[PDB]
Design an enzyme around this catalytic site. Structure first.
Site, PDB file in Angstrom:
ATOM      1  N   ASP A 107      47.611  38.803  28.665  1.00 32.72           N
ATOM      2  CA  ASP A 107      46.526  39.591  29.260  1.00 32.72           C
ATOM      3  C   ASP A 107      46.709  41.108  29.152  1.00 32.72           C
ATOM      4  OD1 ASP A 107      44.314  38.948  32.093  1.00 32.72           O
ATOM      5  OD2 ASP A 107      44.395  40.694  30.760  1.00 32.72           O
ATOM      6  N   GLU A 119      51.280  35.689  37.266  1.00 34.90           N
ATOM      7  CA  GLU A 119      50.119  35.035  36.659  1.00 34.90           C
ATOM      8  C   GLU A 119      49.816  35.476  35.223  1.00 34.90           C
ATOM      9  OE1 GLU A 119      50.532  36.922  39.796  1.00 34.90           O
ATOM     10  OE2 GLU A 119      48.829  35.801  40.612  1.00 34.90           O
ATOM     11  N   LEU A 172      43.264  32.194  21.847  1.00 36.24           N
ATOM     12  CA  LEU A 172      44.621  32.522  22.254  1.00 36.24           C
ATOM     13  C   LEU A 172      45.644  31.480  21.839  1.00 36.24           C
ATOM     14  CD1 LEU A 172      43.507  33.613  25.777  1.00 36.24           C
ATOM     15  CD2 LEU A 172      44.728  35.190  24.254  1.00 36.24           C
ATOM     16  N   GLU A 173      46.897  31.912  21.783  1.00 36.22           N
ATOM     17  CA  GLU A 173      48.030  31.018  21.714  1.00 36.22           C
ATOM     18  C   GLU A 173      48.086  30.218  22.997  1.00 36.22           C
ATOM     19  OE1 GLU A 173      52.922  31.225  21.398  1.00 36.22           O
ATOM     20  OE2 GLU A 173      51.699  33.040  21.096  1.00 36.22           O
ATOM     21  N   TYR A 174      48.274  28.913  22.842  1.00 32.52           N
ATOM     22  CA  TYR A 174      48.475  28.006  23.969  1.00 32.52           C
ATOM     23  C   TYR A 174      49.933  28.109  24.401  1.00 32.52           C
ATOM     24  CZ  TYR A 174      49.257  23.285  26.105  1.00 32.52           C
ATOM     25  OH  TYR A 174      49.635  22.206  26.871  1.00 32.52           O
ATOM     26  N   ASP A 216      49.835  45.577  34.246  1.00 28.04           N
ATOM     27  CA  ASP A 216      49.409  44.416  35.018  1.00 28.04           C
ATOM     28  C   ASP A 216      50.453  43.290  34.916  1.00 28.04           C
ATOM     29  OD1 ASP A 216      47.495  43.291  36.808  1.00 28.04           O
ATOM     30  OD2 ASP A 216      46.391  42.326  35.205  1.00 28.04           O
TER      31      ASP A 216
HETATM   32  O1  LIG Z   1      41.900  37.724  29.978  1.00 30.53           O
HETATM   33  C1  LIG Z   1      42.153  38.463  29.027  1.00 30.53           C
HETATM   34  N1  LIG Z   1      41.425  39.555  28.800  1.00 30.53           N
HETATM   35  C2  LIG Z   1      40.334  39.995  29.577  1.00 30.53           C
HETATM   36  C3  LIG Z   1      39.602  39.151  30.420  1.00 30.53           C
HETATM   37  C4  LIG Z   1      38.528  39.636  31.162  1.00 30.53           C
HETATM   38  C5  LIG Z   1      38.169  40.980  31.062  1.00 30.53           C
HETATM   39  C6  LIG Z   1      38.901  41.814  30.224  1.00 30.53           C
HETATM   40 CL1  LIG Z   1      38.471  43.540  30.076  1.00 30.53          CL
HETATM   41  C7  LIG Z   1      39.981  41.332  29.489  1.00 30.53           C
HETATM   42  N2  LIG Z   1      43.148  38.246  28.149  1.00 30.53           N
HETATM   43  C8  LIG Z   1      44.007  37.210  28.183  1.00 30.53           C
HETATM   44  N3  LIG Z   1      44.979  37.049  27.295  1.00 30.53           N
HETATM   45  C9  LIG Z   1      45.695  36.025  27.558  1.00 30.53           C
HETATM   46  C10 LIG Z   1      45.297  35.369  28.566  1.00 30.53           C
HETATM   47  C11 LIG Z   1      45.952  34.080  29.059  1.00 30.53           C
HETATM   48  C12 LIG Z   1      44.941  32.928  29.141  1.00 30.53           C
HETATM   49  N4  LIG Z   1      45.615  31.804  29.806  1.00 30.53           N
HETATM   50  C13 LIG Z   1      46.380  30.907  29.118  1.00 30.53           C
HETATM   51  N5  LIG Z   1      46.531  31.070  27.777  1.00 30.53           N
HETATM   52  C14 LIG Z   1      47.282  30.224  27.041  1.00 30.53           C
HETATM   53  N6  LIG Z   1      47.923  29.180  27.600  1.00 30.53           N
HETATM   54  C15 LIG Z   1      47.797  28.971  28.929  1.00 30.53           C
HETATM   55  C16 LIG Z   1      48.361  28.022  29.589  1.00 30.53           C
HETATM   56  C17 LIG Z   1      48.199  28.117  30.840  1.00 30.53           C
HETATM   57  S1  LIG Z   1      47.098  29.288  31.325  1.00 30.53           S
HETATM   58  C18 LIG Z   1      47.037  29.813  29.709  1.00 30.53           C
HETATM   59  S2  LIG Z   1      44.056  36.055  29.242  1.00 30.53           S
END
Ligand SMILES: O=C(Nc1cccc(Cl)c1)Nc1ncc(CCNc2ncnc3ccsc23)s1
Length: 256
Positions: free
Chosen positions: A149, A135, A85-87, A131
């Site tokens: 996400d 968060e 992922l992008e930070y 969603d």
């Molecule tokens: O979780 C999923 N998918 C998923 C997960 C479980 C099951 C399923 Cl079905 C799908 N996708 C995500 N995309 C981005 C996400 C953000 C991650 N957090 C961060 N990322 C970058 N910089 C920072 C800094 C602070 S926190 C943070 S999480």
């Protein structure tokens, strides 16, 4: 490129849930800094979400917008899946709201604009997020909002209950207007410091959402009351469009 775990130096945890942790990472060759989310295969298959994950990766190969966090790719091993992922250097909006307690009118309207621009783009490709919540909103190095996400996302039509609209909590049919309701719940929480249908139990919250039972505190201005009230409508079609959000007097007055 066929990524492996050995291509990376792994750093501090950035965040963590019971699907997996997010870590700071550096790609050894380029020195590129990114985030790695480490998902366990056991957890994913035991919950039957492997398909939603596969669709997220697929959706994120097409989406390119400054206010959407990038999913660069993925790779797996025996036990775990790794998301590249992008930070987001300024963290989550969730943590920023905990620190500040609530957001002033200017930073709220700026976020809502950035969120509305991101969703406008998503809705063009028929992608609905479903969603939207603090968060899943992260902050770029210039303090700009990025939606993240896309695991629960789908093509239209198709934790707590706080951000979900009536048509969704009632297991019914829904479209884009889902995100429009969530945007109104966010605007409220940004300004007030808690979401409009908050209760101590799932069942109280459910009652409040379907009956649309919310009140404003004294300090919320009339322009903000107006935006939120035109968004938090039970009837999905009555809500408001993203174009009507972006051209709203309160957004125009207060957005930077
Ligand atoms: O979780 C999923 N998918 C998923 C997960 C479980 C099951 C399923 Cl079905 C799908 N996708 C995500 N995309 C981005 C996400 C953000 C991650 N957090 C961060 N990322 C970058 N910089 C920072 C800094 C602070 S926190 C943070 S999480």
């Amino acid at each position: 490129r066929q990524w492996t775990l050995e291509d990376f130096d792994i750093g501090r945890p950035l965040g963590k849930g019971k699907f997996g942790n997010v870590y700071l990472a550096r790609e050894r060759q380029s020195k590129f800094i990114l985030a790695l989310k480490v998902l366990f295969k056991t957890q994913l298959e035991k919950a039957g979400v492997e398909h939603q994950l596969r669709r997220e990766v697929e959706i994120q190969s097409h989406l390119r917008h400054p206010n959407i966090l990038r999913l660069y790719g993925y790779f797996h091993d025996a036990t775990r899946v790794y998301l590249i992922l992008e930070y987001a250097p300024l963290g989550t909006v969730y943590r920023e709201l905990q620190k500040l307690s609530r957001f002033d009118e200017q930073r709220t309207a700026t976020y809502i604009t950035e969120l509305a621009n991101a969703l406008s783009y998503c809705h063009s490709k028929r992608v609905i997020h479903r969603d939207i919540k603090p968060e899943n909103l992260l902050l770029g190095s210039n303090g700009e909002l990025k939606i993240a996400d896309f695991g629960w996302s789908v093509h239209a039509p198709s934790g707590t209950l706080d951000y979900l609209p009536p048509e969704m909590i009632e297991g019914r049919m829904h479209d884009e207007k889902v995100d429009l309701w969530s945007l109104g719940v966010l605007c409220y929480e940004f300004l007030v410091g808690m979401p409009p249908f908050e209760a101590h139990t799932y069942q109280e919250t459910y009652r409040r959402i379907s009956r649309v039972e919310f009140t404003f505190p004294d300090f919320v201005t009339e322009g903000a009351r107006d935006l939120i009230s035109r968004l938090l409508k039970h009837n999905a079609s009555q809500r408001l469009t993203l174009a009507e959000v972006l051209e709203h007097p309160w957004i125009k007055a207060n957005s930077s």
